[PDB]
Assembly symmetry: C2
Homo-oligomer: 412 residues x 2
């Protein structure tokens, strides 16, 4: 019994793992020359692990925690105590919106939990930003929320469905747990454990047909792969440019076209000494260096690791920037915090920007009017099942990518 | 003499006020802020050069604008558009276009858009221009080039914008090739100077509008009640949603106002001892913090050189929280990527004011996926309340459109 898995990111890898354990022959088809998709770890010469893709899970992410245990891996706690530079340096723990502004937000979150699907479709016509401004939240408070949500969405609240953001705020992601050896230890552990899996590299899927009890997937090279079932883990843009016979369901196609992938750019600097003056260092800014942090994984490392996460148009600013420019953006952020000292940079690692046709720059974001898109993207098409972070309950997370694989494999 | 209330003193409100005043109607002009002109503002530099911190250019064929400028005894100047691009490498003006295949696809789509019914336009409007053109076979590289080509108008990513709206805009896309002698604020000041029988109320935002018994009653934050036979709103979309209306706005108009996203356009001028460019008619695009940089000088035989910078999107917030030293460095790094890394001899700097965006938008109304019909809804009168401003116009998001919107509203009084 052969099952085709399309895409070798963590959802594809976890699907392949679960299938292979039940004695199914898996045909895993990957567009690029590497497995792991939006997960990528660089081992620095210091022994520190640099997560250029997904770096954190939440302590309560059950799928991830269960798989990490199953595979004999280990997690480390990552303390989140973030300063903010906005107008002035604001110490960690001191810059949230006012308790009364939070009460308005809690009321709207509970309202979205209580209303029916028709009411939710109506609320989804409006951006979270415009909806909160209409409900009397200040521009100042909305800017604070934009920092607080930035490491998840990677884009402005002006871009996002009010309904989706209020839905997400029931159980908002926290980035407080790392995998020992970096997040690519998890992807590699899955790869090391596949049995009876043929992997095709550097050969994107261009067409999918189903009929006569078979799924046939054709790649760019002209290779035809047949199976009893297929699990798509492909990003939304690829669902629309692959040729399907028969055609994707009308709502699934529209839903793939509504998805807007956010733009999350990561830079690590390897430094001679600590540029921060406190433990558990992290800080937000509106500058090109949006979020900087002590990223070190090797607790007794001489070299120090400064991580930078920049979202939105900052991705394109950084993709255009030289290494000296990235160092300066980071030094200016440290200077506004009262540091400024010329950083002693030994090495640099940044995001790869050349294969975004296959590997999204960020996570699926849900603009106004996209209500229902996850349900439509998840819906099976006979023996073609759909997974990926954009199909999950906890969408846009490693947890969600993994949970999506279980949901698809359980249908066969 | 009927009284007409004009809400907002940007160029649409000032032109409405001028038009009404010309026929002898008593106008009550209500402005939220301490200045008239709204998204138009000109700083006069000590060099004699005019710095347009707001709207800078009209198109040669913007007839509403050209006709009014002539009528107020003002003059225009030509602005040559020859824009370089830094994107991977320095690409000289005229050498950077989308692929011929992609240009053919875009030509056919812009043609298709004027030959499909309203059901088809509503369906196309569900998708972003970016995702639609990618689906239709345009490359990421082609879409990044269009993003530069359209940036001085929209001031935001094509990933934000209705496919339908952008295809509809491409039949007559705005070109920025004409400036006003003395800066754009010469026009707003000439309107202010030509008002007769106009009471101007400053620093007193409208908070409620009622209509009944053949009158419109407008109330301000201070509690002033102004009565009129008719009322022209030039207010931006967010203000329509927060003002209390009795009777209430039509559901489609309220939704339309809540769908509008205002782009974020930040402007800086450097006054320099020496030209940092090496050609005449200099301008250049990049993805850097300094998105569009240009020779902005207006004064002939100026010793002092004026470098203008327009930056959009998240660049607005980056710049709003930047020091003057950082702004200079963002501009020097943009010049360095074109081959001019020489230190700048900076005499003075002027930037965007960021503090009144509640009342004065940071950019132009943009129309995301799902916003099909918003302009028609925002324009629609409510008895003797008429709607104007750039977001109600055929050439929405321009000075021309703001001016045209005033004529359409005043004609109905
Ligand atoms: C920079 C960044 C930081 C992140 N940080 C975090 C974080 O800290 N924590 C968190 O929980 N989440 C984070 N996320 C989200 C998380 O990375 C993703 O949700 C998750 O890794 C996606 O897994 P996936 O299997 O759904 O997709 P992907 O990892 O994108 O895998 C899809 C695969 O399909 C392949 N493919 C595409 N098209 C084709 C085709 N035509 N044929 C064949 N193969 C194809 C691609 O090459 C890729 O390998 C981050 C995302 C990014 C980009
Ligand atoms: C930075 C920037 C650059 C631009 N560049 C160009 C360009 O080069 N060429 C071009 O053609 N267009 C350009 N535009 C667009 C152009 O500026 C606008 O289309 C036009 O000026 C808008 O005029 P308006 O009268 O519709 O609105 P505004 O100028 O915004 O006027 C609205 C007025 O209403 C007032 N107001 C708001 N709320 C209330 C209230 N509650 N009560 C009373 N008054 C209130 C405001 O304070 C303001 O004075 C640019 C815009 C910006 C922001």
């Amino acid at each position: 019994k052969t099952v085709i898995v399309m895409g070798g990111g963590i959802s594809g890898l976890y699907a392949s793992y679960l299938l292979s354990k039940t004695g199914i022959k898996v045909q895993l088809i990957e567009a690029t020359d590497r497995l792991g998709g939006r997960i990528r770890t660089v081992t620095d010469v210091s022994g520190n692990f640099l997560d250029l893709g997904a770096e954190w899970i939440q302590a309560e992410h059950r799928t991830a925690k269960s798989l990490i245990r199953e595979l004999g891996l280990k997690t480390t706690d990552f303390e989140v105590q973030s300063d903010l530079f906005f107008g002035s340096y604001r110490k960690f723990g001191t810059w949230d919106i006012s308790p009364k502004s939070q009460e308005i937000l809690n009321k709207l979150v509970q309202m979205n939990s209580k209303i029916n699907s028709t009411q939710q479709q109506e609320l989804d016509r409006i951006s979270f930003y415009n909806f909160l401004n209409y409900q009397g939240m200040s521009l100042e408070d909305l800017n604070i929320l934009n920092f607080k949500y930035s490491l998840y969405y990677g884009d402005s609240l002006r871009s996002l469905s009010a309904q989706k953001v209020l839905s997400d705020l029931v159980n908002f992601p926290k980035y407080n747990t790392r995998v020992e050896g970096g997040m690519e230890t998890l992807t590699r552990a899955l790869v090391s454990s596949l049995e009876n899996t043929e992997i095709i590299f550097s050969d994107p899927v261009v067409s999918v047909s189903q009929g006569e009890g078979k799924v046939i997937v054709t790649t760019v090279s002209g290779k035809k792969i047949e199976g009893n079932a297929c699990i798509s883990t492909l990003p939304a843009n690829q669902l629309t440019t692959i040729q399907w016979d028969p055609e994707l369901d009308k709502e699934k196609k529209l839903s793939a076209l509504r998805i807007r992938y956010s733009r999350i750019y990561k830079t690590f600097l390897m430094l001679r000494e600590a540029p921060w003056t406190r433990g558990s260092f992290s800080a937000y800014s509106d500058s090109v260096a949006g979020f900087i942090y002590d990223a070190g994984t090797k607790i007794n490392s001489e070299d120090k690791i400064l991580g930078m996460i920049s979202t939105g148009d900052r991705y394109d600013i950084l993709a255009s920037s030289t290494d000296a420019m990235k160092v300066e953006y980071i030094r200016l952020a440290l200077e506004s915090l009262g540091q400024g000292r010329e950083l002693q940079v030994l090495r640099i690692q940044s995001s790869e920007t050349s294969q975004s046709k296959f590997i999204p720059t960020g996570i699926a974001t849900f603009p106004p009017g996209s209500y229902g898109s996850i349900i439509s993207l998840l819906k099976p098409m006979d023996r073609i099942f759909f997974a990926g972070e954009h199909t999950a309950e906890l969408n846009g997370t490693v947890e969600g990518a993994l949970a999506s694989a279980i949901r698809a494999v359980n249908q066969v």
